[PDB]
Design a protein around this ligand. Structure first.
Ligand SMILES: [Cl-]
Ligand SMILES: [Cl-]
Length: 114
């Protein structure tokens, strides 16, 4: 239930692993929390990428706000960052107009995981 800051003062998130196995269910369901006043049903997506891969494959990367929290049911990281690299996670909140926030830490995704 721990929340951390994103690089936007309007959004917090739950905590993800620093390194996880490709396609494996996460230990803690991902959440995005609005501090500002965001309407129920507001869509939220996550995208992962790096210099070698603009949008790595994910699963279940869309959620909807309910009472200022968007809970991703089973977000999974499919694409591998693999070799000496990691991914930056961008959160897009579909208010009008949309807002972006970056998850605070890079995430490494490998076939074996930690
Ligand atoms: Cl990919
Ligand atoms: Cl790998």
């Amino acid at each position: 239930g721990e929340l951390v800051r994103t690089d936007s003062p309007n959004f917090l998130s739950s905590v993800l692993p620093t390194h996880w196995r490709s396609n494996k269910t996460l230990p803690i369901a991902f959440k995005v929390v609005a501090l500002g006043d965001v309407p129920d049903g507001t869509l939220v997506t996550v995208m992962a990428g790096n210099d070698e891969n603009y949008s790595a494959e994910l699963r279940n990367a869309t959620a909807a706000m309910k009472n200022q929290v968007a809970r991703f049911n089973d977000l999974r990281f499919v694409g591998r960052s693999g070799r000496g690299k990691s991914f930056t996670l961008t959160i897009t909140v579909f208010t009008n107009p949309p807002q972006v926030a970056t998850y605070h830490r890079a995430i490494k995704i490998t076939v074996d995981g930690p």
